[PDB]
Design a binder for this molecule. Sequence first.
Ligand SMILES: [Zn+2]
Ligand SMILES: [Zn+2]
Lengths: 306, 306
Amino acid sequence: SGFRKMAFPSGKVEGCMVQVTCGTTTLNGLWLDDVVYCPRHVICTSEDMLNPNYEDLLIRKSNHNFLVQAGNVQLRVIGHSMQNCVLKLKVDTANPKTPKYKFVRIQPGQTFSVLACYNGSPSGVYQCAMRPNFTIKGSFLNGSCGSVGFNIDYDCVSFCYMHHMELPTGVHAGTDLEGNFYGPFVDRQTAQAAGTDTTITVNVLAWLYAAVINGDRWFLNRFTTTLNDFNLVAMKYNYEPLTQDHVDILGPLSAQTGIAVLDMCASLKELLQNGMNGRTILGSALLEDEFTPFDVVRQCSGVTFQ
Amino acid sequence: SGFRKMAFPSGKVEGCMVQVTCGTTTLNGLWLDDVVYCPRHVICTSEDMLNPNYEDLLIRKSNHNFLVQAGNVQLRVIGHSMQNCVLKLKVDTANPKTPKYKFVRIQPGQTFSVLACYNGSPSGVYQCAMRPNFTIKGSFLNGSCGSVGFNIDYDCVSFCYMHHMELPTGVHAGTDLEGNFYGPFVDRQTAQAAGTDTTITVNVLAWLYAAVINGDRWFLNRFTTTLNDFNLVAMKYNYEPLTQDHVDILGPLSAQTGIAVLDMCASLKELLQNGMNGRTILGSALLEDEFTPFDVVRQCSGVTFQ
Ligand SMILES: [Zn+2]
Ligand SMILES: [Zn+2]
């Protein structure tokens, strides 16, 4: 028993992280097959980032202007191209440590593990969620750009995030592995506004089911509610609206615990109106929304990877 | 910027996890060089665990009674021995993926990463602390026994924990890699009492320094205090006493932020007497004690590994 903010094993990703250096800037890159993916602002100086013309800046660069290192072995760049906001550096050697992988664009509310790297070397791994406003509350220092987010399905590694920048508000923004930003952000050092950040209601409900499974049950109460009645209360407290697709995803958890989804919503409704009263749920004094229904099932059953 | 409960990259440990099977019981083992370490109760049935005579139970077993698997390759057991509560299975093949490693016995308050495994396959990684009562609040299901805890110093892997059992209270207990239990626990299914769990004050202070570094400063107040004055307040709220060695460890953080250790203690004193008043520090409504002073420095500077 017990419940922890668990991240995927990062072994398969550590073997794909390399150090990419262009001119004076150095950041991390993802080496899969004979292609190295990295943020395109590696071709920028600190001055260029204020208002960069990436096309004009890439004209000045040649294949030999890029230094790709994997630990202590060098990689020769044979070709280069810009796909949206990522750079694709074609190298001569195919990464022998390439695992089975896909490129996936996740939706808000979904969770993934981040492997923070600096100078192509892994430093730590943690779990986080894609906020409804397409930002993540990560932990990134200068030089962490190019760090990737990923999920693991048995033997396949689904890459879903590449870190590109920290916003002036302290939150973080990035792209998928095709170079398309999550949200309305651009790879430029300017004041960019992130929308209102809302709580992922479906994740909170899944978290409450994990609490019941692990012995926390004080929040279970006497009432029930309707979808519209709850969504009305939820919107006042900046909670995502609950749809029928969310009820369907929680089905397996409802069957395990014998608590109807709508009954759990009534419990959450009271928690929203009356607070926690100094109590804790799974050791947390706040309502957690970084566990998806699949994460809860995964951790409460023991799904593994190879 | 930002601050996350970060775990070490588990790549170097995933290559050492194997599946150990004796008779009918199967759990995880740590394969280093030509020795496989695993909990000794792998030789026990569900009936034996109530009151096991491990010596008499090991007499009945021979080298061929142990099935060691690494993914899909078999390992032939050449020798076996019992060191305290761990079993050391000498095999014919030396693990090629053996990293530089030490065996370390940590002290309470220190943190480490846990790689939860089932049937020798990694499933997740999370960070936790050794409670002052020599337990850990982990996430372990049946078959997770043998999962190891570890730290990483650049290129060396320090193994410090092997999971052995879950106590009736839901908390978890284990040994070092020499088989010595942390705490007064024995590898037997009986009612075992864990001491009073206290908060790791030095870790809370380090966490507060991380908050100041990341922009959270409302808890900084006007007062100061003495070591004895604070320790008096701390003991009432079940906080570990603060010694001069703790003040010395926090020195670098005090120099970075310009806030004297004793001044930070005064801030924590008020938080203990008046609570948080519905506010949050680094997104947490409770006082976090699972970050050591070294963890904070590590995450706020960007120390990496290879
Ligand atoms: Zn950058
Ligand atoms: Zn066991």
